[PDB]
Amino acid sequence: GLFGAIAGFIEGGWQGMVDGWYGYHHSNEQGSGYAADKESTQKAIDGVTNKVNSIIDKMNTQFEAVGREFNNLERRIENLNKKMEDGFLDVWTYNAELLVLMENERTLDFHDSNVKNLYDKVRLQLRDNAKELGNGCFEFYHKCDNECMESVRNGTYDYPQY
Amino acid sequence: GLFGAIAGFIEGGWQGMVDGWYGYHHSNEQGSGYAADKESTQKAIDGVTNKVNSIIDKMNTQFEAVGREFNNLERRIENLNKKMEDGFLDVWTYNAELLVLMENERTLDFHDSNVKNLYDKVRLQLRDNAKELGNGCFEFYHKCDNECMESVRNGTYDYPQY
Amino acid sequence: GLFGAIAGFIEGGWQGMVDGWYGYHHSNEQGSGYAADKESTQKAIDGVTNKVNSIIDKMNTQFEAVGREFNNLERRIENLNKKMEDGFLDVWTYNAELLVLMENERTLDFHDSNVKNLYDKVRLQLRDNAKELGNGCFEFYHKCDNECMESVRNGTYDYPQY
Amino acid sequence: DQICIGYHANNSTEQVDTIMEKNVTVTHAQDILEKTHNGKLCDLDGVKPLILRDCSVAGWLLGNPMCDEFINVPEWSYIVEKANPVNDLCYPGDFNDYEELKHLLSRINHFEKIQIIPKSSWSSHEASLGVSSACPYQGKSSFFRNVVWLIKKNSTYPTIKRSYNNTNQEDLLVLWGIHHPNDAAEQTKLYRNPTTYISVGTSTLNQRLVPRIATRSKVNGQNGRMEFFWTILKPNDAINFESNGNFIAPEYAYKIVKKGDSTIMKSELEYGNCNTKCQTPMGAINSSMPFHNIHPLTIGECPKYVKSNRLVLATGLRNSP
Amino acid sequence: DQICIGYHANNSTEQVDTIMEKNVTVTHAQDILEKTHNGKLCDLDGVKPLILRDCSVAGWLLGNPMCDEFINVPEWSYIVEKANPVNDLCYPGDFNDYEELKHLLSRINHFEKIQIIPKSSWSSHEASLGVSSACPYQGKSSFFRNVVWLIKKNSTYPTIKRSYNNTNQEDLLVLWGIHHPNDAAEQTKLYRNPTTYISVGTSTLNQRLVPRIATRSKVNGQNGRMEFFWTILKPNDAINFESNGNFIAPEYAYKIVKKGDSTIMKSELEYGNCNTKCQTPMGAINSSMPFHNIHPLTIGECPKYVKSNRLVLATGLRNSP
Amino acid sequence: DQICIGYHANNSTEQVDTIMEKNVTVTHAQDILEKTHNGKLCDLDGVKPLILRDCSVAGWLLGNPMCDEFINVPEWSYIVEKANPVNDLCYPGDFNDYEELKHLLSRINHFEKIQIIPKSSWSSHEASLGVSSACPYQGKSSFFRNVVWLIKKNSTYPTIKRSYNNTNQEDLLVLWGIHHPNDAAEQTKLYRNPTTYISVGTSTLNQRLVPRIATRSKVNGQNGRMEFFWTILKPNDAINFESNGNFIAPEYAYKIVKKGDSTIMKSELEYGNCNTKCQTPMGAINSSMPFHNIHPLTIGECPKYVKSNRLVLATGLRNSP
Ligand SMILES: *[C@@H]1O[C@H](CO)[C@@H](O[C@@H]2O[C@H](CO)[C@@H](O[C@H]3O[C@H](CO[C@H]4O[C@H](CO)[C@@H](O)[C@H](O)[C@@H]4O)[C@@H](O)[C@H](O[C@@H]4O[C@H](CO)[C@@H](O)[C@H](O)[C@@H]4O)[C@@H]3O)[C@H](O)[C@H]2NC(C)=O)[C@H](O)[C@H]1NC(C)=O
Ligand SMILES: *[C@@H]1O[C@H](CO)[C@@H](O[C@@H]2O[C@H](CO)[C@@H](O[C@H]3O[C@H](CO[C@H]4O[C@H](CO)[C@@H](O)[C@H](O)[C@@H]4O)[C@@H](O)[C@H](O[C@@H]4O[C@H](CO)[C@@H](O)[C@H](O)[C@@H]4O)[C@@H]3O)[C@H](O)[C@H]2NC(C)=O)[C@H](O)[C@H]1NC(C)=O
Ligand SMILES: *[C@@H]1O[C@H](CO)[C@@H](O[C@@H]2O[C@H](CO)[C@@H](O[C@H]3O[C@H](CO[C@H]4O[C@H](CO)[C@@H](O)[C@H](O)[C@@H]4O)[C@@H](O)[C@H](O[C@@H]4O[C@H](CO)[C@@H](O)[C@H](O)[C@@H]4O)[C@@H]3O)[C@H](O)[C@H]2NC(C)=O)[C@H](O)[C@H]1NC(C)=O
Ligand SMILES: *[C@H]1O[C@H](CO)[C@@H](O[C@@H]2O[C@H](CO)[C@@H](O[C@@H]3O[C@H](CO)[C@@H](O)[C@H](O)[C@@H]3O)[C@H](O)[C@H]2NC(C)=O)[C@H](O)[C@H]1NC(C)=O
Ligand SMILES: *[C@H]1O[C@H](CO)[C@@H](O[C@@H]2O[C@H](CO)[C@@H](O[C@@H]3O[C@H](CO)[C@@H](O)[C@H](O)[C@@H]3O)[C@H](O)[C@H]2NC(C)=O)[C@H](O)[C@H]1NC(C)=O
Ligand SMILES: *[C@H]1O[C@H](CO)[C@@H](O[C@@H]2O[C@H](CO)[C@@H](O[C@@H]3O[C@H](CO)[C@@H](O)[C@H](O)[C@@H]3O)[C@H](O)[C@H]2NC(C)=O)[C@H](O)[C@H]1NC(C)=O
Ligand SMILES: CC(=O)N[C@H]1[C@H]([C@H](O)[C@H](O)CO)O[C@@](OC[C@H]2O[C@@H](O)[C@H](O)[C@@H](O)[C@H]2O)(C(=O)O)C[C@@H]1O
Ligand SMILES: CC(=O)N[C@H]1[C@H]([C@H](O)[C@H](O)CO)O[C@@](OC[C@H]2O[C@@H](O)[C@H](O)[C@@H](O)[C@H]2O)(C(=O)O)C[C@@H]1O
Ligand SMILES: CC(=O)N[C@H]1[C@H]([C@H](O)[C@H](O)CO)O[C@@](OC[C@H]2O[C@@H](O)[C@H](O)[C@@H](O)[C@H]2O)(C(=O)O)C[C@@H]1O
Ligand SMILES: *[C@@H]1O[C@H](CO)[C@@H](O[C@@H]2O[C@H](CO)[C@@H](O)[C@H](O)[C@H]2NC(C)=O)[C@H](O)[C@H]1NC(C)=O
Ligand SMILES: *[C@@H]1O[C@H](CO)[C@@H](O[C@@H]2O[C@H](CO)[C@@H](O)[C@H](O)[C@H]2NC(C)=O)[C@H](O)[C@H]1NC(C)=O
Ligand SMILES: *[C@@H]1O[C@H](CO)[C@@H](O[C@@H]2O[C@H](CO)[C@@H](O)[C@H](O)[C@H]2NC(C)=O)[C@H](O)[C@H]1NC(C)=O
Ligand SMILES: *[C@@H]1O[C@H](CO)[C@@H](O)[C@H](O)[C@H]1NC(C)=O
Ligand SMILES: *[C@@H]1O[C@H](CO)[C@@H](O)[C@H](O)[C@H]1NC(C)=O
């Protein structure tokens, strides 16, 4: 993807993270586990939901065909009518299919961007108190217990304390 | 935004920066203040201006309705005419509204990208001579007077000198 | 570009790199030269190729004009016919021109993104064993011979060894 | 000790297309195209359609004896007619401005049939022998029930001068016709007078029909032809007939009581005993999708028709293998 | 000591929509949709329109006595006609191929009326008693000023054989008509001859009109009907009339001097004493916007019509609270 | 020692446009718009078009003596007609429902002409003197080769009662006509009878034509007019003629043997001795581009027409100076 995170420097997603689209995994002496980042997840749900509704809404005013009959000596205008009806169906079919292709691309990139930003938000907190491993993970120089871990997810990781 | 800078790791914009879209704020013993980055600002003005003109230009060749009248026994072709006229208006209305929605998204992301790149341009100069604070700012290890500050905006910050 | 690499922190491309869209240049005591990154290059060729075919395919079902003649007292429906035909040509002309403009922008940004990601992939390997110079290059703290260089392109650069 | 950043994966096999890549597996997706229907013709929000079955609009309106099912039809939501109904014009001929009339019906939901010129009120002409073997009813020669085929009485056809006045509030659909006989002998045999006409006048109408003699092919056993005409008689306006032969006179006309949204649907399907908010010629639609691909000609509150086989939006993210 | 990177904010409350977010506040924006008009009918680049007021195109062209304002109208930019003008055909009837003629006017900016058959030149027929109470002028019975209603002179209507030649360089719009009387008595009372016709010939035209007798409703107090016809007479071509009754003869015809861009606009508005480069049926437009949403039927150098309520492009960036 | 990341550049000067920037130089690009044609009319996949040259569809079908090249034309792919062919109706007049017939030809690839009423079989009428100076052939007065202009024989024109039966399997295009003479003297001079008609009947058709006398302008030296009519005679159906003057009788009619995709192309170009899979009125197209901008009216397997001057997709990346 454009932002390099999803199936990039983060090789794959987590079956184990059930309660959000993006989040954290921690490992220390007390144990390990997953925690969803509520804020970025909810921003994603709002964006995708607005997108879908926006797509539905824009296509609500669109061509509707009507029955018209013509006799054996009105073939020209019958043909005109047919070509008009078909022409608009082809235009709207094109519009729908293209919008879906284009916005699917944007949606996948959006998720990649949200992951990348979450990774940077954490990177900018830890700074030099952790080794950036290259795979989505940061290895701490100090012992980081569960409340230490919570503070990293908080946005509160007291850098000067370590 | 997709690039993480605007209303991301840079919490908010600056009422105090009047002469550009993006720039620098400095703080040292001599004082503090704002300076617009001319180059990135001008690249932004050119891009947005070309976009607007591009949008206006593409919509210049578009359907124009004309008056046609029909008698009481020409209702079918009157209806055909009505549906044709309306059909094209709906197509062009859709095109206009979608273009605006899509390009507004791209324009906002464009600005975010320009900010992010400006932040990286500076980060790549300072390297290890400054603490990356996490909020758009770099705190220097040495005293950085006004001419030192100017050199960072220059693209000239002599890293080996410090 | 949006991703800051192409004509950004990497000032310009390489006439000397003939066998790929993106890659590496190395310099050590044994000599210097270019090497294309096969994987990112091939991902780019696949994406652009799918795009072109996608564009061609979507425009394959599109309005076709047909000859219809009308006598001197059928001017209204002759005009209706003319305006219908022209209306669809203008719609399809708009669709084609806009798709090309929009996807050209996306294609240029795609390349920029692939370069940026390749630069990050390498940055995340070297970590603190090399000075990030700010221009696309990394200057090593140790002697890096050709097999050392190969390992950086590999994805295998044994960081702990240095 | 480490903390990692990551994203969701699941067992989903749902796929979406993009410009650069087809068949990308995603964690979540949303289909937006309705592909199914029930295959039936249904009531539209409770209101049953007019299903003409084997009758055409002409057979129904003129009163083809085979179309007695539709002698007094209630309010309809839409109309359903086969592609080639067998019971059209039993006696061969033409229906003038037929397509313009059918278009007029797409704006009509209810007719109320009324009597404007009683059959018995033809005192100087025979009005009960206007029948043909082409329009049989119960094995006997009959005729279009809404118009009277008048012929000579005691060897004379005196000039007809009738007038009807639209006193009722609703626009009136009046139907009449003219008989084109096979030869000069048939003309005198039925109508005495060799040269005849039918003149029709309203506020707007100024018509004069003359019969057209010609040797013609047999159609349903008949050489003669019937050409039918119509008009919309405004309120407070009078229709004025004058003729001395070949006149097919109106008996019953239709009041237009309800105007509104309707359509004539072409379909071979019969009634489904069913209800729906959206109907197509091949079946009804019940979904919340913004799009469908069943058929372009619909009636009711419907999704938008597209010619796609597949429209699926990504909501989630690229799923891992 | 620190240096910070940042971006502009301001007091702007302007909002733009995107696919994923509505009502995003931005530092700068650009409205591209014109929503205002002046509510007036105006000159189009100095050139005043033809405002028919209470007259229709038919009333104007035939010369309805109530439409003397338009007896000689200058060059126009566009034409404005009400939805239901009162002064149409004072004497009831029809105008043949009326809509095709109106369409022809959308390509015409100027007519110059000229005399082709003088009223006095009818020496064998009475040409000064062709009047009716349906077409009053100053309390007296008058008639369409551009055509002559000819009747019998000293109890005889001899066959008319007139011809006009288009010597002038410009295509000529010729108008004539035929009178449909109420009954056989009226026919002989006005024209002597019981069976009549009007034959018209040009290079292309080969017409033969016959009057159609019929009892009809009264319209503006008249039982009779007038059916009007027209043609475009090429340069160097001659129109040939022949008739023995019921002929409504041309007196004045119109030269087509200026062809070009024009239109017939439907509007109840009167003249605004105003100038503009873009006009709609509900008012004129003066802006540099690429779009507007006033009305689809415009004339002049106009923005493009869309059915939106709002089109606003972001130029600046997301503004901070 | 260092390793650098970078990208490709080359000597390319190819340029692409984007929304924010025009004329961006790229390393690689792909033109998708075909701008060239050969300027010739060509065979369409081996099958040569019908090039009417100076003849119109009417001149060809009626058999204008100047159009003998097309007396028996093979199967065609498309038809090419000039804008104003000189050899149309040599004897002046009209061709009824002409445009509806031309539309019918866009669905036809082959006619086979056959004889339905032999010229010699007119025993009670003169059939070999139906000629005019307006339709010359080799300096002599001739006439439309497919229809017979019948006139009186030994001072009498007895009533014609002919019938033809469509026994062959293919729909038949039957053409006939009626002569409108200049005056009453010419009528009796050619046809004896003063009041005449032509009645035509089929399964559907019920026609009665009457000649229309009128003083008319001379066109190609003629005062008289010919009005031509047509019909499609179904299989197993019979066409029935009856007339006592002014009848232009069919001699040859056309069988419709091949139906399919065709078109009437307007072009001044002549045959190019050439082959192509895609043809336009100004030349043929041979390319793999998805688009072209030559002309909207094409036939064959063609790219899609757009009004652009330039469509170029970026494939490579922004090239360095
Ligand atoms: C123009 O000419 C055509 C061709 O001549 C006319 O069509 C033909 O019309 C004649 C009558 O004029 C019909 O004659 C009869 O043929 C049918 C044939 O029946 C079967 O056998 C043939 C085998 O050759 C097959 O092709 C048919 O499809 C069919 O299965 C006879 O059945 C019919 O006689 C009937 O006998 C029944 C009892 O035996 C009776 O109940 C019936 O009432 C009926 O008398 C009759 O003798 C031709 O069928 C017909 N078509 C041809 C020859 O292809 C056409 O009518 C004419 N035009 C106009 C306007 O008239
Ligand atoms: C088909 O039949 C219909 C129905 O019969 C015909 O319409 C009717 O035509 C008659 C004349 O034939 C008219 O008669 C008169 O009625 C008006 C009514 O005036 C007011 O009062 C009624 C209250 O019932 C109200 O509904 C009206 O709207 C109106 O306000 C009389 O005024 C009129 O008499 C006038 O007297 C004036 C002085 O008192 C004079 O100056 C006038 O010149 C005029 O003589 C007249 O007696 C009906 O009004 C009319 N409509 C009905 C009954 O609904 C219709 O004409 C016919 N068709 C054809 C083609 O003729
Ligand atoms: C309505 O009236 C108009 C106008 O009067 C009619 O058009 C005119 O018709 C007359 C005949 O009725 C024609 O007369 C002759 O004029 C040509 C002129 O030739 C040249 O010279 C003039 C210079 O003024 C130039 O403008 C022309 O373009 C042209 O170059 C004569 O040549 C012609 O005489 C010929 O002589 C030849 C030998 O000398 C012969 O071989 C020919 O057979 C022929 O006899 C003839 O005398 C007018 O030309 C014509 N147009 C005008 C005056 O503008 C129109 O016909 C009428 N309507 C109808 C339906 O008839
Ligand atoms: C995010 O997480 C950090 C670290 O987990 C939070 O700090 C901790 O907050 C808890 C609950 O407020 C504190 O508990 C308190 O302990 C004191 C004395 O030990 C007691 O007096 C109180 O009654 C309460 O139990 C805890 O001390 C504190 N620990 C640390 C290391 O900071 C922080 O509050 C969270 N911040 C946000 C923005 O969510
Ligand atoms: C961007 O800013 C840096 C730092 O402010 C610039 O370097 C400074 O440039 C000024 C003006 O050229 C120099 O002033 C000169 O001083 C010398 C002696 O002190 C004098 O001989 C000259 O007449 C002149 O006044 C200043 O020395 C110099 N200082 C440093 C620390 O470099 C630089 O030129 C700017 N670069 C760009 C690309 O804009
Ligand atoms: C990418 O490149 C690295 C470094 O160039 C590769 O490691 C090297 O791989 C080669 C070939 O497999 C090794 O050669 C072997 O040498 C041993 C003894 O010297 C010999 O027994 C074998 O027959 C063979 O010649 C080489 O030792 C090894 N060197 C280092 C420093 O690792 C690596 O294999 C490559 N990895 C990928 C994923 O492409
Ligand atoms: C009102 C009347 O005269 N009805 C006749 C009818 C008409 O005279 C005729 O249709 C006018 O064109 O003709 C009927 O006989 C014709 C009929 O004769 C049968 O023997 C035969 O079976 C048929 O082919 C047909 O020729 C009719 O039935 O229509 C009698 C009717 O009473
Ligand atoms: C040229 C001429 O004959 N004008 C007559 C005119 C015609 O005869 C008639 O319109 C042909 O159809 O008739 C006029 O009288 C009819 C008129 O009589 C009034 O008394 C009454 O007010 C009206 O209802 C109407 O019947 C006419 O005015 O049109 C007289 C005119 O001179
Ligand atoms: C079948 C027949 O009668 N052919 C005549 C023909 C017709 O009588 C006439 O066209 C019917 O309208 O007329 C022809 O003469 C007319 C012709 O006379 C020439 O002298 C002159 O050159 C022409 O202007 C024209 O008036 C004819 O040629 O058409 C004779 C033909 O035999
Ligand atoms: C994407 O996947 C779809 C699966 O639905 C593929 O469509 C099928 O392709 C196979 C070829 O193996 C055909 O036999 C089927 O008829 C196709 N089914 C349908 C419903 O289209 C499609 O080919 C794949 N596309 C790409 C580019 O890989
Ligand atoms: C975006 O803001 C606009 C303000 O212009 C909102 O539109 C108004 O919404 C209110 C609801 O509180 C209505 O009462 C008004 O009638 C609306 N005005 C107009 C001009 O539309 C809109 O609702 C907002 N949209 C979203 C999604 O928040
Ligand atoms: C982009 O480049 C094209 C070159 O093809 C320019 O088009 C030409 O512009 C010159 C102006 O110097 C004109 O004289 C030519 O007539 C143009 N040629 C064509 C084929 O259009 C174009 O102007 C450039 N556009 C921009 C925005 O710089
Ligand atoms: C997939 O996982 C979901 C859990 O969200 C579960 O409901 C479902 O049963 C699983 N299906 C399969 C086929 O594994
Ligand atoms: C429509 O379909 C839904 C499925 O979502 C079903 O539950 C319901 O019974 C249907 N409603 C009607 C009125 O047929």
Ligand SMILES: *[C@@H]1O[C@H](CO)[C@@H](O)[C@H](O)[C@H]1NC(C)=O
């Ligand atoms: C907003 O600030 C601008 C400065 O660009 C000023 O011109 C304007 O008066 C201010 N308006 C309000 C309402 O504060």
Ligand SMILES: *[C@@H]1O[C@H](CO)[C@@H](O)[C@H](O)[C@H]1NC(C)=O
């Ligand atoms: C058009 O509007 C502008 C406002 O931008 C105004 O200044 C000008 O007076 C108007 N011009 C005309 C010709 O009405």
Ligand SMILES: *[C@@H]1O[C@H](CO)[C@@H](O)[C@H](O)[C@H]1NC(C)=O
């Ligand atoms: C440009 O370089 C290519 C190498 O790919 C070569 O084939 C071509 O000849 C060169 N053309 C010019 C004009 O330098």
Ligand SMILES: *[C@@H]1O[C@H](CO)[C@@H](O)[C@H](O)[C@H]1NC(C)=O
């Ligand atoms: C079509 O054009 C190609 C060029 O790509 C050329 O090689 C070929 O000869 C042409 N084919 C035909 C059938 O004219």
